[PDB]
């Protein structure tokens with residue numbers, strides 16, 4: 323039933339909530355990150371971290387703040403990788419151990435057409451042709467944008483570098499999989515080279531969820 327659980331391996335616990343339940347709070351160390359934020363932002367931040375802490379508890383990790391790094395990236399405990407996402411109708415998190423996976427990224431979007439002008443900004447010309455050839459009945463433009471955001475989220479923890487929308491070519495398969503081919507230097511922080519990712523996608527509850535797990539070497 324859960325969207326994230328449907329697109330990541332069993333080894334990576336996940337948790338998701340479709341509403342902001344009443345009474346949640348950030349941990350004291352997290353409060354400065356949203357002290358001057360509007361209610362919508364405070365709620366997505368608090369609810370997604372409740373989900374992340376639930377998934378971390380399944381790995382045996384007790385309650386811990388999840389702060390943000392210089393490029394907005396969540397800062398996980400030592401030996402943990404993870405990803406978080408929030409959109410209207412969805413808050414979710416997924417975590418894993420570094421001995422079991424290299425990286426994970428997820429992104430949730432509403433299953434709707436992209437806003438005017440966004441596809442032109444994010445898609446390579448060949449991607450635009452590819453999407454037009456896919457079967458009718460799915461918002462392929464929104465799925466491409468979702469998959470590209472998941473691509474940067476899986477990439478950043480391994481490279482500490484920017485990955486623009488024009489820096490990767492995503493190919494969507496109607497069967498619930500996609501591939502991301504990196505078009506820039508793929509040197510990773512540990513000296514390895516990243517060239518391509520394998521992704522999974524699902525559409526349910528009016529939402530698109532994309533996920534990439536970069537597997538153990």
Ligand SMILES: CN(C)CCNCc1[nH]c(=S)nc(O)c1Cc1ccc(Cl)cc1
Pocket residue numbers: 393394474478482483484485486487
């Ligand atoms: C602000 N929220 C909505 C998140 C969206 N932005 C994040 C973002 N988007 C794209 S397209 N590519 C990326 O690599 C990054 C992360 C990043 C930022 C800056 C640097 Cl320098 C390095 C990595």
Ligand SMILES: [Mn+2]
Pocket residue numbers: 366407408409
């Ligand atoms: Mn969000």
Ligand SMILES: [Mn+2]
Pocket residue numbers: 429430431468471
């Ligand atoms: Mn998104």
